[PDB]
Input
Amino acid sequence: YLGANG
Amino acid sequence: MVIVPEGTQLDEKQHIVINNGAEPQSFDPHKTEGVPESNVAYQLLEGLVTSDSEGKLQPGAAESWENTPDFKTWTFHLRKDAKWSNGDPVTAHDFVFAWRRLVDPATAAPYASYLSYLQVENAQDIIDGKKKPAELGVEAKDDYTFVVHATNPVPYAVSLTTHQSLLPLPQKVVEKLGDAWVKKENYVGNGAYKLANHIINEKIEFERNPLYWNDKETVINSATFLAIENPSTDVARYRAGDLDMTSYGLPPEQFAKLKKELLGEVYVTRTLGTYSYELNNKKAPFDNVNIRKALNLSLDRNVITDKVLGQGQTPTYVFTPTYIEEGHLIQQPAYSKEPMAQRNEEAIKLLEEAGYSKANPLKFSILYNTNENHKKVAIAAASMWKANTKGLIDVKLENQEWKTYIDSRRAGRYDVARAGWHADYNQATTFGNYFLSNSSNNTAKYANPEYDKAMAESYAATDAEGRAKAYAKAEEILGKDYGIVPIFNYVNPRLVKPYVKGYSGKDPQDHIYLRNLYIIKH
Output
């Protein structure tokens, strides 16, 4: 899944 | 009932507000590839298998399942009384319909490759336009028996089936309405919630799906998902008491004080994730391995993890998190153990050889999705690449809204892009599969037939050691090509109100299912 945050 | 400890006094309203972080691309699981999208899908739909608060697998739409000893045939026994939110029965036909639609070229699904990852007979041929979707190796043996036929052993198959891309769709509805089925007025699902409202860029409202097979164990009556892009704004709404759970980013500079003041409200989940800068391998000058290598040598990961973020993110120089199952033989590359002075020397040479200087530096933009934490990391990266190469790299920042950012990466309209990959299932190939030449997830445009061959050897292995060796060799090849710039393995910091229960802080994929939560009274 492509992650929105970090 | 059952999820709630006996004696626990429940609040009467059972409403929760969660920051989902961004406006989702779509509520159709065949048109999406992001966490904001999957967070919505998981409330409205439920696949074969699902998970509890700690990410452990549990029966979903299937109450039982088994495999042949060769790990190639997977049989799922569906619940005979389960229904869609409009009353239609949920059957193996819905799964057949959905999985065909995922690989059907006409769908143009970002996650088409997922059924290829599962090694389903003819999946890849269908994606490639060589066979019709009806030739996919899945079947309704009867209305409540769904069988999956893999060409290669996939012992981790069940964990793969929890992903958003393999959620069922209501065949009878979608066949009749087309792509318009996803509109609020038309949406039909088999999950614990349904769409009450949707205001673009503002909120998604969920209400209980009373026809959910397990509605009697669902506690939360209604929920709001917000789309707050910036962690600092998320925290401000939380402390104003206007939301109950943040998204999985917190402001680094506030983190220490938040732990002091909000005791037992700060969760940090160690997740199976990697934060990278993706290089566009087919766009000049990043088609040049020497330049990709220079950028890797000259980026000090410890500055980002220790000085910019400092929340428990750990530096990495490989794509796969080495602590994932079957990831243990993956090695950090040799250069990661050289002092920065040596690395920076080597990088400057490579850039001079490629015709850059202080007067004519390498110029490019970092594309990232609007988020103040990503901005901070990009500024630090920009700043490090300039100073460490003595002025031979000059980096601009470009932020786009989530949806635009995803489109830009998929369309190849970028130099360098911020990229986070979170495990779709708790096994190494969720990362390794990403960089296959033909992967629909490979926005980097990386293609090495030797990488593909190393990955292919895993299916010839007969045990976890054999698989882990193949994954190690694949990562070695990806490393020697400097296909991307890995930075860190994730942690997921969140604020969660003390009256919110059922959030563990121990799920390595950090899913939030509304059906796992409850609001306590005291």
